[PDB]
Design a protein around this ligand. Structure first.
Ligand code: ZN
Lengths: 222, 260
């Protein structure tokens, strides 16, 4: 069997590096024999820590969903007014929303009765029926418009990133904000040992080259 | 001259498709009789199989069709060549989420880094006028030609580049290649034509005329290009069973008008 040569070059880059030290309390300076295309790289400490945290959160979320252990907290006094086309869309995707803890029933002018929600979404919603409708509609439309593929549980190691694309936008935004807020900031003091641990964890990431908001985590400076 | 593809990622993606094909559902498509468009917004059309009338989600069927042509014709695509110029940095200006240069350039970089792969395996030709550093001058020269006589609508092109960087996982061969096929399929599917109230006197004669012309275009496209292709080579996957609904059994209708 054959593969594509360019896929392995990115992974091998970060494995051939060593930490020099923290720079301007914002970056981690790293250094790369066999330096044909690869020397000095400045890593944003915030972006780095945020990426480590994001993939831990994404692994926990998809492990819970794939194994059917994802918590679905019961919700009371939650009925949202929907159009006929909206009710049809929700009736069609009821089985798909159940996978993410979003449990509902379609009445009839029609009304969407939300029975259960994941803890993550219960927090974000905070009684706002308008927000919850908009958020559930966004996913239903994403599925309908082939922007999001449905969660296939026919397959069952758990490689979370193979199911990363199925994750609804609202869950993605929550996980990005949680990882961002938990991460080390600019101006924060890091010891050389702390920098070594961060770059070590980063090199084991599925996507070490960007932060939680699609911007680079590092820049070459040599 | 057809090039042999021996990639394990492509072999496993083809097995996934082959295993998903629903034999009875494919037979309905293989022997279809296209009637016409039912809904341009919800992308619904009517077909006849045997003496039964079916409601089809053509947007869903075309998605699966173009993904399948993509897998079958992988690394063997014809090119659609593009006064008029196409700059990726200009296309991404439509998105308010990409307010900064770093966010826009990250998308272009991911694509531009794998330009040799995209041109060889997908015929997605990316050319840059200046040096490799300048992402602002990165242009799109050509796109794959999945179907002879069919040119995809470039309305969805700014979304194709955006999703190529943001939605595609470039860190895994199988997920990357599968993702690129899904983005081509989504770009290639015929556009939704949202409902405009023709009876509304407030709307201009230009908006009413263009809505009619957009409706005529999709009708002409499905009849002369898309459905003959769906009938010729579409293999229906099991998950499309909900996108194929029987709306009439014509023998039951004959009795209603039998004695005139
Ligand atoms: Zn952040």
């Amino acid at each position: 069997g054959k593969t594509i040569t360019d896929f392995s070059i990115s992974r091998s880059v970060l494995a051939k590096y060593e930490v020099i030290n923290q720079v301007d309390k914002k970056f981690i300076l790293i250094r790369c024999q066999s330096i044909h295309n690869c020397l000095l790289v400045l890593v944003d400490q915030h972006a780095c820590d945020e990426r480590i945290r994001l993939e831990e959160l994404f692994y926990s979320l998809l492990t819970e969903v794939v194994t059917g252990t994802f918590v679905a907290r019961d919700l009371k006094d939650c009925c949202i007014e929907v159009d006929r086309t909206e009710a049809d869309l929700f009736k069609h995707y009821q089985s798909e929303f159940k996978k993410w803890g979003i449990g509902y029933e379609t009445i009839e002018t029609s009304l969407l009765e939300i029975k259960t929600l994941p803890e993550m979404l219960t927090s974000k919603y905070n009684g706002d029926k308008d927000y919850l409708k908009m958020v559930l509609l966004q996913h239903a439309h994403d599925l309908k418009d082939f922007k999001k593929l449905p969660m296939d549980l026919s397959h069952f190691k758990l490689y979370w990133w193979k199911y990363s694309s199925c994750v609804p936008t609202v869950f993605h935004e929550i996980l990005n904000s949680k990882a961002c807020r938990s991460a080390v900031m600019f101006g924060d003091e890091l010891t050389r040992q702390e920098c070594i641990i961060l770059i070590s964890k980063l090199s084991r990431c599925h996507n070490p080259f960007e932060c939680a908001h699609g911007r680079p985590s590092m820049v070459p400076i040599a | 001259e057809r090039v042999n593809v021996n990639l394990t990622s492509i072999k496993k993606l083809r097995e996934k498709v082959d295993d998903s094909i629903h034999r009875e559902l494919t037979d309905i498509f293989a022997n279809l009789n296209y009637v016409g468009v039912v809904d341009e917004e919800r992308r619904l059309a009517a077909i006849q199989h045997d003496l039964k009338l079916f409601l089809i989600d053509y947007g869903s069927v075309c998605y699966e069709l173009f993904y399948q042509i993509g897998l079958t014709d992988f690394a063997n695509f014809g090119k659609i060549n593009l006064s008029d110029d196409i700059v990726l940095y200009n296309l991404l200006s439509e998105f308010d989420e990409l307010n900064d240069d770093a966010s826009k350039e990250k998308i272009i970089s991911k694509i531009w880094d794998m330009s040799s792969m995209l041109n060889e395996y997908y015929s997605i030709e990316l050319v840059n006028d200046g040096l490799d550093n300048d992402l602002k001058s990165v242009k799109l020269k050509s796109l794959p030609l999945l179907l002879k006589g069919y040119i995809p609508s470039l309305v969805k092109l700014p979304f194709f580049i955006y999703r190529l960087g943001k939605e595609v996982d470039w860190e895994d061969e199988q997920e990357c290649l599968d993702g690129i096929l899904r983005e081509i399929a989504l770009l290639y599917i015929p556009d939704m034509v949202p409902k405009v109230d023709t009876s509304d006197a407030s709307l201009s004669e230009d908006e009413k005329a263009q809505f009619i012309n957009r409706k005529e275009h999709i009708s002409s496209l499905l009849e002369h290009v898309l459905f003959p292709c769906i009938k010729r080579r579409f293999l229906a996957p099991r998950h499309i069973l909900k996108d194929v609904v029987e709306i009439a059994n014509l023998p039951d209708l004959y009795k209603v008008f039998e004695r005139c």
